[PDB]
Amino acid sequence: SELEEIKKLLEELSKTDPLAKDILWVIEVREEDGHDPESELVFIRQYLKTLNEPSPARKLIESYWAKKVKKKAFEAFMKLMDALFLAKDPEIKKKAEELIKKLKEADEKGDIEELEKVVEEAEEVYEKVK
Amino acid sequence: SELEEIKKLLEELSKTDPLAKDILWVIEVREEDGHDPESELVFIRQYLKTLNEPSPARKLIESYWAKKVKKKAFEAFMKLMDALFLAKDPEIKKKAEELIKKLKEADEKGDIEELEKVVEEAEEVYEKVK
Amino acid sequence: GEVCPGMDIRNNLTRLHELENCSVIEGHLQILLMFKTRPEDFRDLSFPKLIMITDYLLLFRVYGLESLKDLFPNLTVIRGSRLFFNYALVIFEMVHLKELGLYNLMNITRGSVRIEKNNELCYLATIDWSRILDSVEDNYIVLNKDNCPATVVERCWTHSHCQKVCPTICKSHGCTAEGLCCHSECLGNCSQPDDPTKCVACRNFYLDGRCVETCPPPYYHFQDWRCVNFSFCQDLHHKYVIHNNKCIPECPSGYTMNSSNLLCTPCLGPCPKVCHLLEGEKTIDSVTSAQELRGCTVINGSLIINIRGAELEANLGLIEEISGYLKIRRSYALVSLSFFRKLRLIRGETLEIGNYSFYALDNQNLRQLWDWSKHNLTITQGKLFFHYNPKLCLSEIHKMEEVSGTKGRQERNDIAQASCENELLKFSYIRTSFDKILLRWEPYWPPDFRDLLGFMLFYKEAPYQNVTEFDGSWTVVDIDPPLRSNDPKSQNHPGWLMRGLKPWTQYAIFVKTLVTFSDERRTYGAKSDIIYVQTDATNPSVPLDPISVSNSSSQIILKWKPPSDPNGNITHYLVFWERQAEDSELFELDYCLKGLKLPSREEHRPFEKVVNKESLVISGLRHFTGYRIELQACNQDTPEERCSVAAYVSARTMPEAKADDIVGPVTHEIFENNVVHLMWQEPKEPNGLIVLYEVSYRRYGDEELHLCVSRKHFALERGCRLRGLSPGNYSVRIRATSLAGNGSWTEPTYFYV
Amino acid sequence: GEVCPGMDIRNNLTRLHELENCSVIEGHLQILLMFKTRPEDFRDLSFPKLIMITDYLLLFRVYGLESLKDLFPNLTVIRGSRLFFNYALVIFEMVHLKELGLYNLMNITRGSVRIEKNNELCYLATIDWSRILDSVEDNYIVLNKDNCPATVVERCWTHSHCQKVCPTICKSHGCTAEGLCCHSECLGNCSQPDDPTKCVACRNFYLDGRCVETCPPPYYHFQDWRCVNFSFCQDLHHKYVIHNNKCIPECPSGYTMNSSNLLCTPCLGPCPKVCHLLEGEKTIDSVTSAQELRGCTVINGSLIINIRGAELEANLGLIEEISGYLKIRRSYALVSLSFFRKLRLIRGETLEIGNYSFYALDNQNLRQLWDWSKHNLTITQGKLFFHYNPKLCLSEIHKMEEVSGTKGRQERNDIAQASCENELLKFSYIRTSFDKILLRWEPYWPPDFRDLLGFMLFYKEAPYQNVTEFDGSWTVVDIDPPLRSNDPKSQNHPGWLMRGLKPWTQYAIFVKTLVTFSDERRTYGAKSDIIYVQTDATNPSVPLDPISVSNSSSQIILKWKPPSDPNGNITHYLVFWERQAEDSELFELDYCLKGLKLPSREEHRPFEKVVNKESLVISGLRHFTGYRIELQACNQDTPEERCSVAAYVSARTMPEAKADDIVGPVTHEIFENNVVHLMWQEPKEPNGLIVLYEVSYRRYGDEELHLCVSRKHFALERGCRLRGLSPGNYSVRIRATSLAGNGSWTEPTYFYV
C-alpha cells in the first residue's frame, strides 16, 4: 500500500542520509513488535517536527501525513453534519455548527494542527449522537 | 645587589619556561617607569600566590620574599621592644607585649602571612611612641 | 458569458436561479440538504451557461436529482485551485442519481474526485478518470450501485454520451467538442481548432476571450484565473493588494503597502504589525509564549511578565510603544530588563489597579533595567511599584523617574541586599604586551577596612564598544587585598595581570570590590569604570594557500590567501622569488642512457612590496626554469617590521615551445674514412635546461636513424662523431629535448658519407 | 656534662646561676634588659661547662658585659636548628662590650650572625665568618666601633686569642683545640684526634659520648640532636609521638596514634580532627570559609549556612556528627543539602532559640535534602523550622521526621511553588540500537487535561548507578503532548528517541511532566522513575599501536595496544599473517649491475584467536621473508562476530646469518680452451631470497678476482663461464648475497685453468 512505497522512498533517501536510516530503523522495530505502522507514522512525524531541523526531503515525505489527516477531516466533517441535522439537542446542534465552521476555516488557512485539534472535538461530539 | 642576581636567575629560568619570561617582562616594564623594584616584587609574589599553580622553581625563588620579610620582622620586633620599655601608656605597653608574643609565635609556626599582618600592627603601635 | 463569485446553497433551491446569467464561478459551488426538494424540481431545471469552475463542486442529500447532466451540460474545467479537503469534485449520498451524465467535464487541474454512499449511481467503471483527472491516486469510490475508446472496456458517462476522449496528440491542450486538437494555450476544448481566441478554458491565463501566458498592464493577474485592470483591484480593496504583477490578496512577509501606493513596497525588515493579545492581555512565563508572540513589531494591550530563570530578546525587543501597562512579578531570575531593544514609550492607556503603569515584586535579581546612557524610554502616565526588589538601588529608580517624566507621579512607597557601589575605583596604570596586560588601581579601603574581602576583576573580548555589564557569561577572576600597608604612600597598589590573550584585540576591563555583606549599613564599595584596552600587535601568521600557477611561458601568477592569524593589520605582503639552478645530478650525470633513465629528481631575491594584492603576477622569469619563491607577510612597515616567517613554493615556469630547440643548424665535418663529426650550440635560454638532443641522420636510399649525444658525449666528441657510414649523400635533423620535452628538429644538414 | 632545656632571662641575673650544672641548652638562650646589672656583676661570672647550643643565642641592652668570653669560654657549636628570625647569633646594643672574645665558637650550622648598634665593640673585621659560619650572605653588621692566618689580614677575636682556624684538610669535620683534624663524624673540635668517642659536637647525631650516624633502638632520634630511649619520649608525652624511627613532636598529615601504641599508624585517609570553630560557632557564605574549614573530619560547635549561588562537597562532607545545631537561612540557591556525605547525627547539644536543631528559611531552591533511600541521618533532639521554603514538598519533611526520630518534636508550624509530582509515570517500551534508543510511556493526563504543556525528558551517561537527580548539569530536551486522542485505546503513547549515543554505555533515563503552574491546587503531575539503559555493542575500532618487532631470526613478536574505541568487550583479538612473495621487479630484473643498482623497492592466512595477549609471538615464519600481517579485533565470538576492519603491517623477519650462504660447494667444469663453467644451487630457505652471489676466483701466483652471476646470468650460462684464463691451478670462493647482506664464502673450489 501507500505505506509500502513510503517505506521504499525513505529507504532510498536513507542510502544517502542518516536521518532516513533512523526512520527506517524505527519503522522496522515497530513492525517486528506487532503495532500499527500508522501510529508510529504519526509519532515519527511529531518527532521530526519537534526536532525542528529543516531536513526538507523527510518532512516533504511526511506531508503524506498531512494528506491522510486532510482526508480524515472530511469523514469527521460528514459525521458532524449528519449529527447536526440529526442531533437530539439544540445546544449540541449549535456546537456542531461551530465545529463545522471551525473545520472549514482551518482548512481555509491550510493548517493541519488545527485540523487535528478540531477532528478530536468532532469525534467527541459525535459520541453523543451514537 | 640581591635583586640583580634574582633577575638573572629568573632570566635563566625564563629561557626554559614562559612564566619566568612574563615575570621578567613585568620587572622590566616596572623598571622603565621609575618605580621601586621591591614593591613590584611583593606584588608579583602575591600574583604567583593567587595563581595557585605549583610552579615550584618560581615560588622557590620568591622564597626570597619570605627571607626579606623575616629580616624586616626583626626590626619590627626591636622597635616594639624599645617602645614597650619606653611606652608612655600602660595599655600601649600591654598591647606591645601582646604583639611581641604574637610575633614570636608566628615565627615559631614559620608563617609569613601572620608575620606581615603583625608587622603592620607593629608599625601602627610604633607610630604612637614617635 | 458573464462572471460571478462563488456561493453555497442550502435547502432552498430558489437561490439556485441566480446562476442563469453566469459563466464562471469565481469560487466554489455547493449544494446540500435539499430535503424539501423533489424530483419534480430538478428533472429539467438547467443552467447551460456555466462553463468553468475555479475551486470545487459539491453535493449532498440532493433528493430529486435524476442526472447531474441536466444542470451543467457545458461545465468543462474544474480548476480546483481551492480544494474542499484536497477534493475537487465531491458527490455524496443522493439516491435519485441514475448517472452523473455530465458529458463535458474535460480536466480537473487539482485534487481528486470523491463519490460515496449513493444508490442507483451507475456508470462509474465506464468513466476513464485517468484521462480526465491529472492525478488518480485517490478517486475514493465505494458503496455505490457499481462506440468510444476502450481500455481493458468502453468508457462512457451514459450509453447516449461517452467520454470525449480524443487522440493523444491533442495532449492536455485539449480538443474541440468534435475531437480536434486545439491551440497549446487552450485547455479542455476549443470552439475552433488551433485558435487561442476561440476556446473556453485557458491553461495559463484567460484574457478578453483569448488564451495567453500573462496579462498586460494595467491588467494584472487575479487569483491566477483571469486578467483585470488596476481599477478592479482598487475597488475590491476599497470595499486586495498589488505585488509582483500579481493582484494577490495580501502581500507576503517583509512587505507592506500605502493607501496611495497600492503596490506593497518592502518594509525596513520589521514591518508594522499591531498585535492584539487575548482580550488585549497576556502573561509570559515560558519561551513558548514569547515565540507565540514572536516578531510583534508593535503591540496593543498590557503585557505581564512572570517568568522563571538571548531567546527572549529574539522573541522580544520589537515594540516601541505598549498601549497597556507592563508588569514584572515574581520573575526572580531577571538579571536585567534590557530584553526590549525597541521599547520606547509605555502608553499606559490601560492602567493597573491603583493607576500603576509599572510593577516589580519578588524579583530580587534585577541587576539593572536598561542602558540609560542611551535608552530614551518614556512613560505617558501611571504610578510605579518596585516593592520587595531593592536589589537594584534607588538611584536607578530615580533615573526611571527623570527619564520617564514621572517625577510628580512617584513616592517612596513604590520601593522596599542592596549593592550599589557608592564609590568609584580609578585605574592607576595599565600596560599592554602582545598577549599580556598589566592592571593597577587605587587601593580602595572601606571605612571598616577590615571588611574588604579582595577585589574582583572581569574582562572579555570587545571587538566593538558594546559592553553588557550586568548581562548573562564573561567575567573571569578575583584578587585579594594587598595588605593594610599602614600609612602614607607605599600602599602597594593592588594589581593583577593576565597571560593568555590574543594580540590586537580590544579588551573590556573593569574591577569591582567584593566586600563582606554587612547586614547593617554597608559601604557597598567602589565599582571601577569600564575601560577598553587593545593588546599590542605581534608578527602575523604565515601567509596561507600559496599556489604558484603559471599563466604564460615566462610569466607566473602566484595566488595566496591572507594568513589564518593576521594578528595585526597586514600592511603589505613582501614576496621574494629566486631562480634556482638545476640539481647537480641533473647537470653532471649522463642523460643519453637508452631506455631513458633520465633522473626523475647580499642575496637580493628579486622582491616587490605587493600591497593588498593577495595574488601576485611575477614577471621576468624564464620558461621552465628553477625558481624558489617565498611569501613574507608583515603588519608593520616603517619601524622594525614584524614580518612573520615566510611560506615557500618552488614554482617552475611553464615551458616555451620555441626556446627549447637547437637554435640554428647543426655544425658538422666529414672524414674520408666514412666518419662524420657533428657540432652545435644549445640555446642560452632553454626550458630550464637542455640535457639531451635527439639526432636523426639519413642517407639517400637508406632511412633516417637516431643517435643520442649527451653533454658528456658532446664534450668528449666535441658533439658527435658518426661511424660506420656508407657512401652517398646524407641528411641530418636534430631536435633538442629539454626537460619539458622534445623541441624542434634542426634544418636537414646535408653532406656525403 | 649535663643536658638542660632552654630558657630566657630578663632583668634578673640571678636566674643565670641555673646553668652551672649545664652542658647543652636543648633550646635557645636569651638575655635582655639587664638594666639593674652593672659591670661589677658579669666581669667574672662564668659558666664554662656550656659546650653547645641548639637553637640560638641572643643579647640586648646588657649593661656590664665587658667581654662575652667571660661567659661561654667553651661554647663551640650553635646548631641553629631553630632560628631567631633566621639569625643564629644575635648581639644588639651593649655599650660595655670591648670584644666578643669567645674564642671557641667553631660552627654555625644555620642562619647568620647579626650585630648592630654597639659602642666599644671591636674585633669585627678580624673574625673570619666565612670560615666559621656556613653561609655568610647576611652577617648584617653596622653602627659599631669598627700569629694566625691572614686573608687580605690576620683574623683574631682578641689580640690574645685568634680564630682557631686549622688546615682545610680537617674540613667541617673539625679539628682539635690544638688544630688537628678529627674523625669525620665529629664537628668543630675533638678532645682526641680521629676518635669519634672523644669530641664535643656531632655532625649527625650524638650518642653516649660518641659521634654516630643514627641512634640504636630503643633509643631513637630526638629533635635531630641526641638519642633517648623510648621511655624518655613516653614520659615527655605523658606530661610527643613516635614515627619513622624519629621521636618527633607531632605526626604528619594522614597519620594518628594510639595511647598504648605510641607509634602513629596511618589513618583511613580522613583522620579524626575535631574542629572547634570561633566560639564553637561560625557562618558560611563563601567558598573561602569552606576552604578555611577544609577537611574537618569532625566538628564541635553549631554551624550556620547563609550562602549565595562540587567545591563545597570537597570542603564539606567530612563530618559524621555536629555537636551544635546546623542552620540554613536565605541561601536561595541551595539545589539540595547533599553536600554533607558523612553527616550522620546532628547531636543538637547546642540548641537554637526555641530549642530548634534545624532551620530553613528563604531558600526556595531546596529541591531535596538527602538521598534518603540510603542516608541514615539521625537527630538527637531539637525542633525544626522550614518556613518560607515549600519548594520541597511536605513528604520530604515527613521523611525527615521518620528517619531523624523526631516524630514527637515537630508541628506543621515548621513549614510554609510546590512541585511534588503526586503521580507516577511508567515507561511502556524501550529498545536499544547501537547508538539510538526508543522511549514510550503511558499518556499521563492531569485532571485538567488542557493544562499539560508537554513532557520533559532527561538523560546522561551513567557508567555506575549513582544518579543525582536534582543535582547540578545533564538534562537535555523536552517533548509535546501527542494529542487528546479522545477515548478508549489508540491514545498514541507519546514518545521520543535519541540519535547520537555511544555504543555500550549505560544510560540513565527519566521523564518528568512540565505542567502549567496553576496557582490553585495543581495536579503537580507524574515524575517517571529513573531507569538505566545500555545501548548495544557495535563493531570495535581498529586495533591500535601495532608494531611487528623481530626477536629471533624465524620468530616475530607483534605488539599492539587495545583499540582506541573498544565499543564492546573485546572477546578476543584475531590475528592473520600471510607470507608475501617478493616484488616482481625483485624477482625478474637483473641484479648484477656493477655499481650495485639493486632495486630499492580459501586463503587461510595462518591465524590464531589470541585472547587477552595484546602482544603476539608469531612462530613458524622464515627469516627475512616477506610477510603480510593483519590484526582483526572483535567484541563478539559465538554469533556473527562484529570483527572491526583490521589494521595492517608487512613485517619482515630478521635475517638468518646461516641460511643466506651458498649451501654446499660450487659445482664447476673446465675446458681445454682456458674456459671454466661454474654451477651451484641456492638454499631453499634463504633470507627471503638470494638475488646475487659474490664470486671470488684465484690462481696460484695471481690474486683473487670477483665476478657477478645473477639469476639471469646463472640461467643463460648455467651458472658462470669464466673466460680469459691463464694456465695453472685455480681456487674459487663464492658468497651468496641475499637482501639481508653478504653470507658466507663457499669452500675454495680448486681446478686448473
Tab-separated table of N, CA and C in Angstrom, chain B residues 84 87 89-101:
chain	number	residue	atom	x	y	z
B	84	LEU	N	57.971	49.225	74.106
B	84	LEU	CA	57.436	48.582	75.298
B	84	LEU	C	58.190	49.025	76.539
B	87	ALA	N	57.332	52.941	76.385
B	87	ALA	CA	55.998	53.409	76.042
B	87	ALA	C	55.464	54.351	77.116
B	89	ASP	N	52.231	54.795	77.908
B	89	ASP	CA	50.950	54.394	78.466
B	89	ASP	C	50.955	52.916	78.836
B	90	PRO	N	50.347	52.543	79.969
B	90	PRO	CA	50.298	51.111	80.322
B	90	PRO	C	49.541	50.257	79.318
B	91	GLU	N	48.428	50.757	78.775
B	91	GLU	CA	47.691	49.975	77.787
B	91	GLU	C	48.526	49.768	76.532
B	92	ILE	N	49.267	50.795	76.120
B	92	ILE	CA	50.185	50.629	74.999
B	92	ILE	C	51.223	49.567	75.326
B	93	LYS	N	51.697	49.537	76.573
B	93	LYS	CA	52.680	48.531	76.958
B	93	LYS	C	52.097	47.126	76.877
B	94	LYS	N	50.860	46.946	77.345
B	94	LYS	CA	50.242	45.626	77.270
B	94	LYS	C	50.026	45.210	75.820
B	95	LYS	N	49.588	46.145	74.975
B	95	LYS	CA	49.413	45.829	73.563
B	95	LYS	C	50.744	45.468	72.917
B	96	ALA	N	51.812	46.181	73.280
B	96	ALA	CA	53.131	45.861	72.751
B	96	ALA	C	53.573	44.473	73.185
B	97	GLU	N	53.336	44.119	74.449
B	97	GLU	CA	53.691	42.782	74.912
B	97	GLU	C	52.919	41.722	74.140
B	98	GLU	N	51.624	41.957	73.924
B	98	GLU	CA	50.828	41.017	73.146
B	98	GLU	C	51.377	40.882	71.733
B	99	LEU	N	51.757	42.002	71.117
B	99	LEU	CA	52.306	41.949	69.768
B	99	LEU	C	53.627	41.195	69.736
B	100	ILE	N	54.468	41.382	70.752
B	100	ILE	CA	55.738	40.664	70.802
B	100	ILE	C	55.486	39.164	70.882
B	101	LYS	N	54.557	38.762	71.750
B	101	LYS	CA	54.227	37.345	71.854
B	101	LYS	C	53.682	36.819	70.532
